[PDB]
Amino acid sequence: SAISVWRAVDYVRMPWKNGGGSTEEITRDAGTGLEGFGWRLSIADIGESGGFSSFAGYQRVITVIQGAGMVLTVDGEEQRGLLPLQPFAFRGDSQVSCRLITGPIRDFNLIYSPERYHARLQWVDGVQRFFSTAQTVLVFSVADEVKVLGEKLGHHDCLQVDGNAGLLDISVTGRCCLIELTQRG
Amino acid sequence: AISVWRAVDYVRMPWKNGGGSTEEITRDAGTGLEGFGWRLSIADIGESGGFSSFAGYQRVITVIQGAGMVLTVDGEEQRGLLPLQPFAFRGDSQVSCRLITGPIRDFNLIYSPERYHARLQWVDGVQRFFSTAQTVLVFSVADEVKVLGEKLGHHDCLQVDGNAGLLDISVTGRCCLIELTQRG
């Protein structure tokens, strides 16, 4: 139905309050409410070790997309290593800090409200084909050319399908992340 | 192919400098190298200050809420923008805005002239036109604009995509007509 292509050359980089990194917003839900937000997609540049903000009540899934990896500590559990393209889910409630090992990292970030949205996320490669009733489908490229729905996405470009109301049949070729989001009733 | 974008759904993003925010309406598919080739949006200008530049692009902006503001373009004398008065300027210009009676919202067109042919016209009443343009956009500033069997409310936007013949379009009500066609 309604296809949008977010080109990474258009993303606006915004320094974090604290000076330790910056965020490029890709896209997000269209709600307005003072009552919290529904879902947001972004790229975070992490330039220093330190603590992350918390987002109480939200679910997060983050993935290293540039640089060699970093280590997270979540709620003082044992340290966890994040390698490139390995997705990692955690609660926004959690207290989280990051230790850079090889220097700065860029992360692909999904955050959503589980009260408000159903969600799916999967990193894929090669030739893929799926059918989905999801209202919003997102395709985020980590390759020079990901082909999807007649568009060609370069590195960190993102295709978005919105307002779907039947069963979508989507083929994708290349290395990318597939996200699907649907408002809960 | 007809889509209708509803204003209640426009995604709003705050500006890097904190002086305002922008609501996305619609944009082309763009290129990986150059980004979008055209974009429609609504700029909510909360404070006086400078605009970003877009070297190589052409802009047309229109005040759509508030009583107006004053633009300074490069060395030119100040220019007053009144409601619904479109103003064209180059993206490579250095432009700043002085608010006079408080915040303003502008309907913004930007396009790449290397990539697109363009047309813009604010209209009212009953209109009929024929166009070969690839993309036809109709942005409403009324409670009801009728076009192509649709009804647009305040700040809603109709989009016709992939047109390949001579489209015959009737429109009723106060709105902005934009036509965009990829250039070889």
CA distance B139 to B155: 6
Residue A45 pairs in a beta bridge with: A22, A106
Query: Which residue among B16, B30, B33 places its CB closest to the CB of A5?
Result: B30
Domain A1-11+115-185 bears CATH identifier 2.60.120.10: yes
CA distance B150 to B156: 11
Query: Solved how?
Result: X-ray
Q: Domain map of chain B by residue range?
A: 1-10+114-184, 11-113
Report the top-level CATH class of A12-114.
Answer: mainly beta
Resolution (A): 1.8
User: In sequence order, what DSSP letters do the residues of A64-93 get, joined into one string?
Assistant: EEESS-EEEEETT-S-EEE-BT--EEEETT
CB A141 within 8 A of CB A154: yes
Query: Which residue among A7, A25, A28 places its CB closest to the CB of B36?
Result: A7
Q: Any idea which fold B1-10+114-184 has?
A: Jelly Rolls (2.60.120)
- Please enumerate in sequence order all residues whose Cβ is within 8 A of that of A136, keeping only pairs 6 or more positions apart, or say none: A160, A161, A162, A164, A180, A181, A182
B83: DSSP letter: B
H or E, element range at A28:
strand A21-28
Which of A34, A25, A32, A22 shows the shortest CA–CA distance to A6? Answer: A25
Long-range contacts of the stretch B146-153 (C-beta < 8 A, 24+):
B146/B170, B146/B171, B146/B172, B146/B173, B147/B171, B147/B172, B147/B175, B148/B2, B150/B2, B150/B4, B152/B4, B153/B6, B153/B7
CB A67 within 8 A of CB A103: yes
In a mutational test of the B interface, the residue from A1, A3, A7 whose CB has the highest number of chain B CBs within 10 Å is A7
Distance of residue B23 Cα from the nearest chain A Cα, in angstroms: 10
Residue in the structure block whose two tokens are 């997000």: A28
CA distance B63 to A132: 41
Question: From B17, which residue of chain A is nearest by alpha-carbon distance?
Answer: A14
CA distance A48 to A102: 11
Per-residue tokens: A165: 């109301």
- In CATH, the number for domain B11-113 is 2.60.120.10
- Cα A33 to Cα A4, A38, B82: the distances in Å are 23, 9, 31
